[PDB]
Every structure is written in structure tokens, then in C-alpha cells.
Design an enzyme around this catalytic site. Structure first.
Site: not given
Ligand SMILES: [Zn+2]
Length: 257
Positions: A103, A195-196
Site C-alpha cells: 500500500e 486504508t480500507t
Molecule cells: Zn491494512
């Protein structure tokens, strides 16, 4: 339904969660040239000695190894953190190929996968209240390169066949998360987000300079997982990673000269 698909992917998350275009979104590219050293950063403390893993589960986005967070058994302290952060779960993001999957990037370089150890500030009593605060969580992020197999990871890989599909879970006891660390805890840190979805800006990000090695054999087992539920058309769990978001006005502090 959100996911990493054509229509339900990160480019479209903003339609349901406007904060996706926020001021503190994660992940980000770490520019080594501009991420200045900070001598005010205290040394990073990691107490995973009495850590108590409970179960592993497929949640249709990744697999989470969950821990007993009822006590200060496995805690993260110091570095940029104020107070004690308890480990609740760790998970990964990874790619379809070895060339991508992380990420966070470092001077625009992607890794094969990224490990996230999620902690919450005991100051706020529980996780639910934690995620509603800017310093509520601390995620320890560790890069994965494809090389020598990680022994500390094999116990995880050996159980993945049994949580193939979304919703499946299994007893996963006596797992030592120390097995997944590198040797130098030299980190970058910045204030960021999940990050979600729902992408809440509640995370103190601590990203280790030192990646860890995993065998192609180990990462292939990750890619044999399913996004889909049982009985649905198969969709392999791969490229479950959000690309780097704008840094904006934020500064990335390094723990090393
Ligand atoms: Zn994660």
C-alpha cells in the site's frame, strides 16, 4: 459492497465515503529525500512476549489474525505514540504479481506485500471509541520482499487452505507475532487513515525501513485465497491494496539520521 474490482475499487470508494478525498488519507509515498530525521522521536517499544492470538479469519478483503486485547499482553509504546497501544489484529495486502502488492511505497518503489499490525490507544477504553479519535489507532507497517522463507510466517500459511472463502475462520492459538519483525525497528511515522472503508483518519502510521523476506512458495498460498463467499463464482484474493494518496501539508518524520 466495496472491494478492489473494476467498479467497486479505490477510485470509486469516495462515492460512498467522502473522507476518501480527506486531508489525512493513507497510504502515501515515502520520499526519503524530504522525510526529515526527528531527534524528538523517543525509542520504539514492542512488548509481544505474552501475546495471545485467538483465531484467523477471511473477511472478503484480507485475512486477520486476531489477538486477546483485554489486557496489556502485547503492546506498542514510545516512538511517536502517547500512552499504551494494544495489538488487536494483524493482516496483509498483496499483489497478483511480485512487482506490486504493498500500500505504502518508498521513493515510488512497491513491495510484493505489506503487513499491518493494528493497535488501539487504551486511553479510549475500547476499539469502537478509539477509531473516532485522530490518535485512536497505531498501525505498525512492515514491507515484504520475495526471498528467504520467513519461519515465523509458516504457521499462518499452513492454515490458509482452511479459510479459503469470505466468512470462514479457525482457532489460531499460541502464534508469536515477534516471528514477523525485522531486526531494526527504524521507522517513518505520519498521521493517516485506515486504508480500507470507512477510511477513518484515526491512525498514527509507523512504517519499518527494513522489509522482511518471504518465499514465492509462501506468497503463492496468499493468492490461492478467495474474495467471494462459499458457493459463489471464484474471485482470487489478489491486488487487495490501495494506491498512495496525496500527502498534502503532512510531514513524514524518520526515526534515524
Ligand atoms: Zn491494512
Amino acid at each position: 459492497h466495496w472491494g478492489y474490482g473494476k467498479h467497486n475499487g479505490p477510485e470509486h470508494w469516495h462515492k460512498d465515503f467522502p473522507i476518501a478525498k480527506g486531508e489525512r488519507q493513507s497510504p502515501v509515498d515515502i520520499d526519503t529525500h524530504t522525510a526529515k530525521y526527528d531527534p524528538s522521536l523517543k525509542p520504539l517499544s514492542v512488548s509481544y512476549d505474552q501475546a495471545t492470538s485467538l483465531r484467523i479469519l477471511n473477511n472478503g478483503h484480507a485475512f486477520n489474525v486476531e489477538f486477546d486485547d483485554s489486557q496489556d499482553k502485547a503492546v506498542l509504546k514510545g516512538g511517536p505514540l502517547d500512552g499504551t497501544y494494544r495489538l488487536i489484529q494483524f493482516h496483509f495486502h498483496w499483489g497478483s504479481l511480485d512487482g506490486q502488492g504493498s500500500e505504502h511505497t518508498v521513493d515510488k518503489k512497491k513491495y510484493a506485500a505489506e503487513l499491518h499490525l493494528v493497535h488501539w490507544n487504551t486511553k479510549y477504553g475500547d476499539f469502537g471509541k478509539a477509531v473516532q479519535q485522530p490518535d485512536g489507532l497505531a498501525v505498525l507497517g512492515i514491507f515484504l520482499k520475495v526471498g528467504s522463507a520467513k519461519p515465523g510466517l509458516q504457521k499462518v500459511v499452513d492454515v490458509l487452505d482452511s479459510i479459503k472463502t469470505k466468512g470462514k475462520s479457525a482457532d489460531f492459538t499460541n502464534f508469536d507475532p515477534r516471528g514477523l519483525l525485522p531486526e531494526s525497528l527504524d521507522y517513518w511515522t505520519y498521521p493517516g487513515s485506515l486504508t480500507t472503508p470507512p477510511l477513518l483518519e484515526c491512525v498514527t502510521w509507523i512504517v519499518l525501513k527494513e522489509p522482511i523476506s518471504v518465499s514465492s512458495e509462501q506468497v503463492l498460498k496468499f493468492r490461492k485465497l478467495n474474495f467471494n463467499g462459499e458457493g459463489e463464482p471464484e474471485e482470487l484474493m489478489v491486488d487487495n491494496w490501495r494506491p498512495a494518496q496525496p500527502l498534502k501539508n503532512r510531514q513524514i518524520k524518520a526515526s534515524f539520521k
